[PDB]
Design a protein around this ligand. Structure first.
Ligand SMILES: *C(=O)[C@@H](NC(=O)/C(=N\OCC(=O)O)c1csc(N)n1)[C@@H]1NC(C(=O)O)=C(C=C)CS1
Length: 326
């Protein structure tokens, strides 16, 4: 069977990843590029050393939020008109707080601004066991059986052990662990009209058997919300691509070092798809411990996402949906 890898995309992803890691004087980085319609793995790139894309568990951080928001919409726990109070709070020593105090936000705003408070409130409308099953259905804790040695399953703690604060902090991506490949896979539920794809290392003549996570209508509405992330007002404007609308999500995760979360060491993540309305490509970028030129997901991982996505669309012959201006 024809290998799914596209050499030009692989080269592009590798070169842009290593350029970004150098520019930000980071420890390491990883990129996954997927066919958004059939789940072909087009590129898997790493900084020198092991195949971190498949071997390394990371916390998804705010890259989990699109799924929580989609689930809440899908189940009718919220809608596109609700305006949620998003003031911060604590339970005991644990804060539930955003980068800024947003007094209130609608679901679009929660996505756009990356509101931990907003996402936690939507998650809290579901029971713990329901959320556990949901995360497991996204593939968290479920090995890909890629064939690569040292491949990780990720980690999903048994729901019977969860404190109520833990369900909340999981909704903005603490505690959950998965590889970047497992995380990129999850995004196929949003691009492939609600249906999670298994991913493939060979070209597929038709979409393989998947599993429905969301209604098609939910997936379509969520993709539209995610375009807010790359437009003025969003966290991820650095990932906007000339000629296209891009649905994306940023993540900035405190690193866990010496038994505690560090306040000044982070992992920067940017995951997105285009064309947003009718997606063809998913690009996932993570940069571990940037020490120069910033640390926010949008600022650090946005620019390489932009280059890799723009280049991939061109390589694949996908036409711009709006006039070019660059
Ligand atoms: C999303 O990733 C979410 N991030 C956090 O809540 C985390 N840390 O915040 C940064 C800090 O210094 O406290 C976090 C989640 S899991 C983990 N280990 N850390 C929000 N998203 C973004 C973003 O890029 O979209 C943020 C940007 C600064 C922080 S809040």
């Amino acid at each position: 069977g024809a290998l799914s890898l596209d050499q030009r995309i692989q080269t592009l992803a590798y070169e842009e990843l290593n350029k970004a890691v150098e520019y930000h004087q980071a420890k390491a980085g990883t990129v996954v590029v997927l066919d958004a319609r059939t789940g072909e793995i087009l590129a898997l790139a790493n900084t020198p050393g092991r195949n971190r894309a498949v071997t390394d568990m990371i916390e998804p951080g705010s890259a989990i939020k699109p799924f929580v928001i989609a689930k809440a919409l899908d189940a009718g726990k919220t809608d596109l008109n609700e305006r949620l109070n998003t003031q911060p709070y604590k339970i005991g020593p644990s804060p539930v707080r955003d980068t800024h105090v947003y007094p209130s936000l609608d679901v679009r705003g929660i996505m756009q601004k990356s509101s931990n408070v907003g996402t936690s409130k939507l998650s809290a409308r579901f029971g713990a066991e329901e959320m556990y099953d949901f995360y497991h259905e996204l593939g968290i804790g479920v090995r890909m059986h890629s064939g690569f040695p040292g491949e990780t399953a990720g980690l999903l703690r048994n729901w019977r052990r969860w404190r109520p604060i833990e369900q909340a902090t999981m909704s903005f991506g603490y505690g959950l662990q998965l590889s970047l490949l497992q995380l990129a896979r999850a995004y196929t539920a949003l691009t492939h009209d609600g249906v999670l794809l298994p991913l493939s290392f060979e070209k597929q003549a038709v979409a393989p058997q998947g599993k429905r996570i969301f209604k098609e209508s939910t997936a379509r509405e969520v993709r539209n919300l995610m375009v807010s992330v790359t437009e003025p007002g969003g966290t991820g404007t650095a990932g906007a691509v000339d000629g296209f609308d891009v649905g994306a999500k940023t993540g900035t995760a405190r690193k866990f070092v010496n038994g505690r979360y560090a306040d000044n060491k982070h992992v920067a993540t940017f995951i997105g798809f285009a064309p947003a309305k009718n997606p063809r490509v998913i690009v996932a970028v993570t940069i571990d411990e940037p020490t120069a030129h910033g640390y926010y997901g949008g600022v650090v991982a946005g620019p390489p996402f932009k280059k890799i996505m723009g280049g991939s669309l061109n390589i694949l012959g996908i036409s711009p949906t709006k006039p070019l201006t660059a």
